[PDB]
Amino acid sequence: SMNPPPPETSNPNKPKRQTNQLQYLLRVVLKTLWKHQFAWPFQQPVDAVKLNLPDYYKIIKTPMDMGTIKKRLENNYYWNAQECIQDFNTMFTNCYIYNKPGDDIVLMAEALEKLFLQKINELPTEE
Numbered sequence: 001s002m003n004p005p006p007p008e009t010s011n012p013n014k015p016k017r018q019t020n021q022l023q024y025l026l027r028v029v030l031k032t033l034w035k036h037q038f039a040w041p042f043q044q045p046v047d048a049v050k051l052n053l054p055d056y057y058k059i060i061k062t063p064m065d066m067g068t069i070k071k072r073l074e075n076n077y078y079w080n081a082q083e084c085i086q087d088f089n090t091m092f093t094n095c096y097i098y099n100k101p102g103d104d105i106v107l108m109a110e111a112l113e114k115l116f117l118q119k120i121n122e123l124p125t126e127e
């Protein structure tokens with residue numbers, strides 16, 4: 001029971017939608033970040049057990065990762081792009097909170113966040 005349940009990636013009670021913005025988030029934004037050399041620690045929930053970070057889920061109570069975001073986008077979990085943008089920002093913020101300055105995971109998150117902001121800068125207008 002050492003790791004928490006992951007964030008939900010489906011919910012039969014949550015209304016679902018496709019928008020051009022959510023298609024762009026999957027096809028352009030997530031695709032760009034996912035194949036980056038720094039993506040791999042962010043491609044699934046933090047395994048606090050295997051990594052021996054027992055305080056991770058004592059400190060981080062709103063976990064998020066690109067594995068979860070990928071499944072949410074694939075499952076049409078989101079109603080709008082802003083929900084998905086908030087998930088990316090949660091993932092980056094958690095990294096900046098939990099880790100100390102000089103930690104390479106912070107420099108990796110900063111590089112992914114810079115690329116994230118470049119890609120969402122041209123988020124297309126809603127059709």
Ligand SMILES: Cc1cc2c(-c3ccco3)cnc(N[C@@H]3CCN(C)C[C@H]3C(=O)NC3CCCCC3)c2[nH]c1=O
Pocket residue numbers: 040041042046047051094095098099103104105106
């Ligand atoms: C999201 C997340 C993941 C993560 C992972 C990981 C690796 C595979 C999956 O997850 C490892 N270590 C972390 N923190 C380290 C804590 C100890 N300091 C000294 C170095 C810290 C550090 O910078 N570690 C990195 C991990 C990636 C390779 C370079 C070293 C992580 N912190 C995070 O917020």
